[PDB]
Design a protein around this motif. Structure first.
Motif, mmCIF file in Angstrom:
data_model
loop_
_atom_site.group_PDB
_atom_site.id
_atom_site.type_symbol
_atom_site.label_atom_id
_atom_site.label_comp_id
_atom_site.label_asym_id
_atom_site.label_seq_id
_atom_site.Cartn_x
_atom_site.Cartn_y
_atom_site.Cartn_z
ATOM 1 N N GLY A 81 0.777 -1.223 0.000
ATOM 2 C CA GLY A 81 0.000 0.000 0.000
ATOM 3 C C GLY A 81 0.814 1.281 0.000
ATOM 4 N N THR A 82 2.137 1.163 -0.052
ATOM 5 C CA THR A 82 3.020 2.326 -0.155
ATOM 6 C C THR A 82 3.663 2.290 -1.536
ATOM 7 O OG1 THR A 82 3.448 2.568 2.210
ATOM 8 C CG2 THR A 82 5.157 3.364 0.738
ATOM 9 N N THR A 83 3.660 3.424 -2.232
ATOM 10 C CA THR A 83 4.155 3.465 -3.600
ATOM 11 C C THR A 83 5.667 3.263 -3.700
ATOM 12 O OG1 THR A 83 2.446 5.163 -4.004
ATOM 13 C CG2 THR A 83 4.081 4.790 -5.762
ATOM 14 N N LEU A 84 6.402 3.997 -2.866
ATOM 15 C CA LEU A 84 7.850 4.128 -3.006
ATOM 16 C C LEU A 84 8.643 3.250 -2.043
ATOM 17 C CD1 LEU A 84 8.073 7.963 -3.644
ATOM 18 C CD2 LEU A 84 7.550 6.114 -5.248
ATOM 19 N N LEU A 85 9.960 3.272 -2.223
ATOM 20 C CA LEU A 85 10.912 2.588 -1.369
ATOM 21 C C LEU A 85 11.552 3.614 -0.437
ATOM 22 C CD1 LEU A 85 12.720 0.239 -0.507
ATOM 23 C CD2 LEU A 85 14.016 0.568 -2.625
ATOM 24 N N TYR A 86 11.301 3.470 0.865
ATOM 25 C CA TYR A 86 11.788 4.403 1.876
ATOM 26 C C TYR A 86 12.856 3.712 2.720
ATOM 27 C CZ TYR A 86 7.767 7.279 0.676
ATOM 28 O OH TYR A 86 6.844 8.019 -0.016
ATOM 29 N N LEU A 87 14.070 4.251 2.675
ATOM 30 C CA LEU A 87 15.231 3.615 3.287
ATOM 31 C C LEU A 87 16.030 4.644 4.087
ATOM 32 C CD1 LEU A 87 16.347 1.323 0.365
ATOM 33 C CD2 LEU A 87 15.254 0.604 2.498
ATOM 34 N N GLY B 221 11.986 7.511 -6.937
ATOM 35 C CA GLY B 221 11.236 6.435 -6.321
ATOM 36 C C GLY B 221 11.860 5.795 -5.092
ATOM 37 N N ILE B 222 13.067 6.239 -4.747
ATOM 38 C CA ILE B 222 13.765 5.875 -3.520
ATOM 39 C C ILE B 222 13.874 7.156 -2.715
ATOM 40 C CG2 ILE B 222 15.880 5.035 -2.510
ATOM 41 C CD1 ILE B 222 16.259 3.279 -4.982
ATOM 42 N N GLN B 223 13.352 7.132 -1.497
ATOM 43 C CA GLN B 223 13.294 8.311 -0.655
ATOM 44 C C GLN B 223 13.720 7.949 0.753
ATOM 45 O OE1 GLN B 223 12.864 11.277 -1.759
ATOM 46 N NE2 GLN B 223 11.991 10.912 -3.793
ATOM 47 N N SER B 224 14.100 8.959 1.530
ATOM 48 C CA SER B 224 14.514 8.730 2.901
ATOM 49 C C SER B 224 13.342 8.380 3.806
ATOM 50 C CB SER B 224 15.179 9.988 3.432
ATOM 51 O OG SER B 224 15.572 9.781 4.773
ATOM 52 N N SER B 225 13.569 7.416 4.695
ATOM 53 C CA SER B 225 12.603 7.081 5.740
ATOM 54 C C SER B 225 12.797 7.900 7.008
ATOM 55 C CB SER B 225 12.740 5.618 6.120
ATOM 56 O OG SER B 225 14.028 5.406 6.658
ATOM 57 N N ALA B 226 13.763 8.815 7.017
ATOM 58 C CA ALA B 226 14.064 9.545 8.243
ATOM 59 C C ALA B 226 12.819 10.329 8.643
ATOM 60 C CB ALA B 226 15.244 10.466 8.032
ATOM 61 N N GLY B 227 12.385 10.184 9.882
ATOM 62 C CA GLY B 227 11.166 10.852 10.291
ATOM 63 C C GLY B 227 9.860 10.136 9.965
ATOM 64 N N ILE B 228 9.925 8.997 9.271
ATOM 65 C CA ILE B 228 8.781 8.080 9.191
ATOM 66 C C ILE B 228 8.830 7.172 10.397
ATOM 67 C CG2 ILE B 228 7.709 6.088 8.022
ATOM 68 C CD1 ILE B 228 8.680 7.228 5.380
ATOM 69 N N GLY B 229 10.039 6.803 10.796
ATOM 70 C CA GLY B 229 10.216 5.927 11.934
ATOM 71 C C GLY B 229 10.331 4.461 11.563
ATOM 72 N N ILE B 230 10.187 4.147 10.277
ATOM 73 C CA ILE B 230 10.321 2.775 9.817
ATOM 74 C C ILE B 230 10.735 2.807 8.350
ATOM 75 C CG2 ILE B 230 7.923 2.439 9.102
ATOM 76 C CD1 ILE B 230 8.141 -0.310 10.753
ATOM 77 N N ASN B 231 11.528 1.826 7.934
ATOM 78 C CA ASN B 231 11.834 1.666 6.524
ATOM 79 C C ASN B 231 10.698 0.903 5.855
ATOM 80 O OD1 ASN B 231 14.544 2.840 6.715
ATOM 81 N ND2 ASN B 231 15.023 0.999 7.888
ATOM 82 N N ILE B 232 10.414 1.261 4.605
ATOM 83 C CA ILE B 232 9.264 0.707 3.897
ATOM 84 C C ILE B 232 9.666 0.200 2.532
ATOM 85 C CG2 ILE B 232 6.900 0.998 3.115
ATOM 86 C CD1 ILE B 232 6.683 3.418 4.991
#
Length: 330
Positions: free
Chosen positions: A221-227, A293-304
């Motif tokens: 359900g999440t479009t991008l890759l958050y790392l 399409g690759i974005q930072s997860s900083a401040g999401i609290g989890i990698n996605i």
């Protein structure tokens, strides 16, 4: 039993995927966003505030002979992107790709946030994370998969998302023709209610593989890759002119670029995301700045590990007593 349903991108960017779902008797077919990062099955309905409906197909429980109000039950959910919805609850018969669950909680929206209203192609969500995240109160409800599980030939579902093309969700079996090589399985923690796992590292383009543990969730359900920011910076440093833009809300790059691939580790195996999968096109119509399409997860609290990653693989969500995740190339 088994089920098999085609899932189709909603737009030319693969922003999300919709899968037809039959609800009620006679069937009402709604196109739902299957979301392995949440655990509510909710729909636009005859109860949804009229001004918040704009082109969606609605579920009308009064037209279903098998619908029953789940008396006193309410639900309210907020997603990682800031969107939200809430309402009350019916039980009804729900079928996906020929697999039928009776007594499924169907959460009828009374209110949806603007992002949902503005997306005419998504008639609701079908959550496939663990039922511990389900928001129904005062009696938490089970997901479609949890309800189906005992009846399935094998307690699994698989996600085979396409790049700019339809793909498939299967329930109860592994289609051995749908992937190449072998499936590598990896441990899952259910402690946060997600399909949470640990990648063994990454590579950028033809670069050397960096062995490093990256905990994250498999989230259709999440479009991008958050790392992590370190990883994302290493990726975009290989694209001339790429930069993080606070005004746009992430990394952008010149639309004239050729993007490198990105590899992630699954145990000793490797899944390669082609560079083209990482292009989300102009930031606004006609712009020569393109969104990454690759974005930072900083401040999401989890990698996605969202669709950008998952669509590069055939993914097994193994819901056995000890759950695991499997990844194969395809």
């Amino acid at each position: 039993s088994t089920g098999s349903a085609t899932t189709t991108p909603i737009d030319s960017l693969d922003d999300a995927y919709i899968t037809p779902v039959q609800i009620g008797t006679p069937a009402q077919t709604l196109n739902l966003d299957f979301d392995t990062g949440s655990s509510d099955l909710w729909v636009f309905s005859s109860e949804t505030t009229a001004s918040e409906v704009d082109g969606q197909t609605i579920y009308t429980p009064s037209k279903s002979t098998t619908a029953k109000l789940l008396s006193g039950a309410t639900w309210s959910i907020s997603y990682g992107d800031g969107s939200s919805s809430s309402g009350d609850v019916y039980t009804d018969t729900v079928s996906v790709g020929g697999l039928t669950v009776t007594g499924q909680a169907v959460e009828s929206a009374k209110k949806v946030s603007s992002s949902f209203t503005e997306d005419s192609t998504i008639d609701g969500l079908l959550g496939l994370a663990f039922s511990t995240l389900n928001t129904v109160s005062p009696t938490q409800q089970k997901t479609f998969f949890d309800n189906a599980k005992a009846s399935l030939d094998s307690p699994v579902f698989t996600a085979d998302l396409g790049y700019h093309a339809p793909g498939t969700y299967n329930f109860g079996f592994i289609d051995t023709t749908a992937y190449t090589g072998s499936i590598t399985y990896t441990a899952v923690s259910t402690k946060q209610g997600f399909w949470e796992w640990t990648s063994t590292g990454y590579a950028v383009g033809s670069g050397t593989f960096k062995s490093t543990s990256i905990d994250g969730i498999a989230d259709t359900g999440t479009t991008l890759l958050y790392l992590p920011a370190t990883v994302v910076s290493a990726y975009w440093a290989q694209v001339s002119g790429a930069k993080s833009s606070s005004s746009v809300g992430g990394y952008v790059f010149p639309c004239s670029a050729t993007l490198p691939s990105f590899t992630f580790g699954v145990g000793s195996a490797r899944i390669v995301i082609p560079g083209d999968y990482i292009d989300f096109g102009p930031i606004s119509t006609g712009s020569s700045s393109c969104f990454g399409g690759i974005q930072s997860s900083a401040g999401i609290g989890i990698n996605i590990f969202g669709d950008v990653a998952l669509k590069a693989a055939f993914v097994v969500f193994n819901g056995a007593t000890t759950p695991t995740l499997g990844f194969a190339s395809k």
